[PDB]
Amino acid sequence: AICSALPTIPYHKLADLRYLSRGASGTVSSARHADWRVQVAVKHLLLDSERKDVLREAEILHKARFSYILPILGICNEPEFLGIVTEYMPNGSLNELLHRKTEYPDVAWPLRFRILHEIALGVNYLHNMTPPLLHHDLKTQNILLDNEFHVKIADFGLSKWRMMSTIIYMPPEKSRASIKHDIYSYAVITWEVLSRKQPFEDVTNPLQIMYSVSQGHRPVINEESLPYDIPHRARMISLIESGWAQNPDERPSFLKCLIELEPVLRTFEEITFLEAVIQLKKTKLQ
């Protein structure tokens, strides 16, 4: 009954456009809104089909608003520019946090587990929509972190509306159920977050990754990839291994993951998150 139109942001109101990153789908730049006095991020690419792609992603973000989804502030739809405008995330992506070990020599476990929990919450919300929305392109580069390192899921270019129950996060290719797609990616992201290593480190051609996963093989789980000092390491490993099970029916729902995670996160006090973020921003200086 209650319907909301996505605001149309005039391009001329976006000032100080500066390149932040160039990806497969577009270019993300920071900017300042002249009227609202806030900083925004602009993702821009035109063939009418790709214009439809951009508009489709904008509408999906608009309908999928939630606490852990990148909040879209508007769409810029002009003759000379087509871009999605979202909140600006000063702390980049989960990828940077996990792998730039000079910037972030230490990332305290409480922060990692809160990130994992919030990814699970956001994706569960998506899967609980009507109809359920399947993200199908989760990766540590899609997960942005706001000023206090809370998750914002992004990149909804590869998405579907029909659930029932780069490629390093893609499940292997019988009767096929693509409801269990996101959970495989989440398993890989979990292994990544807990290991701070690149999945399939020794692989030089991504097709090697496809062949290995199709053969039932996954990122290595041993003391080197996952030290034994990981909180709830056994439960987390079980979560991971069920998440990337070769059979999609063996993979849990995101609700099961939240059920399985709640005690794990409960082991940490809420203040430790803030402490870890302050340690992060202090050691990143100097």
125 binds a second copy (CB under 8 A): yes
Q: Give the position of tokens 């806030």.
A: 38
> How many residues make contact with a second copy (CB under 8 A)?
42
Q: Which stretch binds ligand KRE (CB under 6 A): 114-122, 139-147, 164-172, 266-274?
A: 139-147
Q: How far is CA 148 from CA 79, 119, 145, 179, 198, in A?
A: 37, 15, 7, 31, 25
Of residues 108 and 274, the one with the C-beta less far from a second copy: 274
59 binds, among a second copy, ligand KRE, none (CB under 5 to 8 A by kind): a second copy
Q: Give the position of tokens 């319907």.
A: 3
- Three-state DSSP state, 222: coil
User: How many angstroms separate the CA atoms of 99 and 107, rounded?
Assistant: 10
Q: Check if the beta carbon of residue 186 is closer than 8 Å to that of residue 257.
A: yes
Q: Quick one: which of 15, 18, 19, 37 contacts a second copy (CB under 8 A)?
A: 37
CB of 274 to a second copy, least distance (A): 5
CA 203 to chain centre: 23
Of residues 20 and 237, the one with the C-beta less far from ligand KRE: 20
User: How many angstroms separate the CA atoms of 161 and 136, rounded?
Assistant: 11
Q: Is 137 assigned a catalytic role? A: yes
Q: At 177, list the tokens.
A: 């159920």
Q: Quick one: which of 158, 166, 281, 283 contacts a second copy (CB under 8 A)?
A: 281
Q: Per-residue string for binding with ligand KRE, 15-54, x by CB under 6 A?
A: -----xx-x-xx-x------------x-x-----------
58 binds, among a second copy, ligand KRE, none (CB under 5 to 8 A by kind): a second copy
DSSP per-residue codes, 108-131: -HHHHHHHHHHHHHHHHHHHTSSS
User: How many angstroms separate the CA atoms of 265 and 52, rounded?
Assistant: 41
153 binds, among a second copy, ligand KRE, none (CB under 5 to 8 A by kind): none
- Three-state DSSP state, 241: helix
Q: Is 24 annotated as a binding residue?
A: yes
Q: Quick one: which of 52, 65, 100, 162 contacts a second copy (CB under 8 A)?
A: 65
81 binds a second copy (CB under 8 A): no
CA 161 to chain centre: 18
Site residues (vs ligand KRE, CB under 6 A): 20-21, 23, 25-26, 28, 41, 43, 70, 84, 86-89, 92, 96, 141-142, 144, 154-155
Query: Binding site for ATP: residue ranges?
Result: 20-28, 43
Task: Give me the active site residues, please.
Answer: 137
